[PDB]
Amino acid sequence: TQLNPTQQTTQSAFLATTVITAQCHAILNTQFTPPTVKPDWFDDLSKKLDSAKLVAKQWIDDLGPQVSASIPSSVINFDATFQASIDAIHELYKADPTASGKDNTTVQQASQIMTALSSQVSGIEATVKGMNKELSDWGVKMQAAHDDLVNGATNIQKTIIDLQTDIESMNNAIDNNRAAIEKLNKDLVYAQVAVGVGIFMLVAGVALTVATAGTAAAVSGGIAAVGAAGVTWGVLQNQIDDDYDSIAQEQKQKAEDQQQIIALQGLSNASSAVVSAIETSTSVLSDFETTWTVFGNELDDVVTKLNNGASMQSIIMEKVMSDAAKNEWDDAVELAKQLASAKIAIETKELAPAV
Ligand SMILES: C[As](C)(=O)[O-]
């Protein structure tokens, strides 16, 4: 069975911010080690990686947990007043089911109940919008760091005239792998069934050189995918194998220092993935804001109707007052509670393509 509209935007928004977190961890799992003879460009490119890692940590340590928690708590924290409000309206109707007219006290109370509930929705709208603005601002900083890393690698790669053909091959495989991993994550974000509570993050370094992480001239690109009880470590290995198997063979033909230069775009695999995840999050956070805006305007419509002389009878038939809406809301709250307490596992490994 499928997610109802409020469930869908709740879950999608939350999973998308969880992908940002996963890819920030992937940035932190990106690394490279100088060759035995450290070249002119190493320190400056390393600083650019450090800058990307710094921005990643701001999300992991501060902004991320706050944005991600705001999505379910907006639903959870609205529940008590929403229920009491709808119950009060039902009770008003039961006591005076023919009440109509702006001077009728039942109408007046119903109007005041829905006006106050709408004012609460407007506050929630602003809260979500503010969160999406904080994400936006942070994402500008991450984009800057990403662009600087990309451009740094690109300029270095231009200066070694012999390797241009191998760099092209590596960067084709890198683009292929990025796209494949991105699809795994986007598929989850946009899934239309309940993900459950077994949500996890798979974070890998990917050897792009013969030299393993920590040894001279090594390059380790980062990848991450979110899944739930569908991503697996075996799936990630088969993709790495699919995309990089041939590059791993080619890299063995090259000197250690050369393999490193060929792999330098890998240092921004993780940050390109974070940039994509920022894109997706901004979109589904707008969808989530829209969930609240729609609801707010529905309540406003009830207020307008009452003030123009509508009967309570006409109001009790509206969508917001209906049994279906109550049951969808109740299901959205439950979904949101499960997300808010979900304990998201992080598993970290170092992977290499096949030989
Ligand atoms: C009451 As609602 C935010 O699920 O439309």
Distance from residue 17's CA to the centre of ligand 1 (Å): 21
Please state, in angstroms and rounded to a whole number, the distance separating the CA atoms of residues 288 and 335: 14
Does 7 sit in the ligand 1 pocket, CB within 6 Å? Answer: no
The residue among 150, 139, 161, 267 whose CA lies nearest residue 206 is 267
Please count the other Cβ atoms lying within 10 Å of the Cβ belonging to residue 223. 28
Residue 225's SS3 state is strand
2-18 per-residue burial string, b: 16 or more CB within 10 A, e: under 16: ebbebbbbbbbbbbbbb
Is any atom of ligand 1 closer than 6 Å to the C-beta of 332? yes
CA distance 239 to 173: 11
Residue type (1 letter), 113: I
Q: Report CA torsion sign: 287, 291, 292, 295.
A: positive
For ligand 1, the distance from its centroid to the CA atom of residue 283, given in whole angstroms, is 19
Expressed as residue numbers, the domain containing 238 is 1-355
Nearest to 197 by CA among 341, 43, 36: 341
Q: Report strand pairing: 31-32 vs 219-228.
A: antiparallel
Cα distance between residue 72 and residue 131, in whole Å: 13
Helix (H) or strand (E) holding 349: strand 345-351
* Backbone φ and ψ of 120, nearest 5°: -65, -40
Q: Is the CB of 265 under 6 A from ligand 1?
A: no
Residue 178, Ramachandran bin (φ over 0: left; ψ between -120 and 50: alpha; else beta) = alpha
DSSP state of 36: S
Instruction: Name which residue sits closest to atom 5 of ligand 1, judged by CA.
Output: 295
CA distances from 111 to 89, 211, 276, 295 (A): 9, 70, 44, 16
Tallying the residues shown for the chain, one arrives at 355
Burial of 256 per CB tally in 10 Å (0-12, 13-18, 19+): middle
- Angle formed by the axes of helices 269-307 and 64-95, nearest 10°: 20
Q: In the chain, where does DSSP find H-type helix?
A: 5-28, 42-58, 64-95, 105-158, 164-189, 233-251, 256-262, 269-307, 312-316, 323-341
288 lines ligand 1 (CB under 6 A): no
- Residues in the chain preceding a C-to-N separation beyond 2.5 angstroms (breaks): 229
Q: Which atom of ligand 1 is nearest to the CA of 121?
A: 3
Edge-to-edge strand ranges of the sheet holding 345-351: 31-32, 219-228, 199-207, 345-351
Overall domain count for the chain: 1
Q: Which amino acid is at 331?
A: D
Residue among 124, 290, 328, 330 whose CB has most ligand 1 atoms within 8 A, to mutate: 328
With a 6 Å cutoff on the Cβ, whether 295 touches ligand 1 is yes
Please report, to the nearest 10 degrees, the dihedral formed by the alpha carbons of residues 280, 283, 287, 293 taken in order.
150
Under DSSP, is residue 210 helix (H, G, I), strand (E, B) or coil? coil
Q: Is 10 in the pocket of ligand 1 (CB under 6 A)?
A: no
Distance of CA 295 to the CA centre of its chain: 23
**Closest-CA residue to 30 (of 348, 266, 239):** 266
Helix H or strand E encompassing 346: strand 345-351
Annotate 70-117 with DSSP letters as a single string: HHHHHHHHHHHHHHHHHHHHHHHHHH-TT--STT-HHHHHHHHHHHHH
Residue 237: closest CA among 272, 259, 206 = 206
Side chain identity at residue 168, one-letter code: E
Q: Are strands 345-351 and 199-207 parallel, antiparallel or unpaired?
A: parallel
d(CA 309, CA 312): 9
In contact, 181 and 223? CB cutoff 8 Å: yes
The 3-class secondary structure across 284-309, one letter per residue, is: HHHHHHHHHHHHHHHHHHHHHHHHCC
Q: DSSP character for 322? A: S
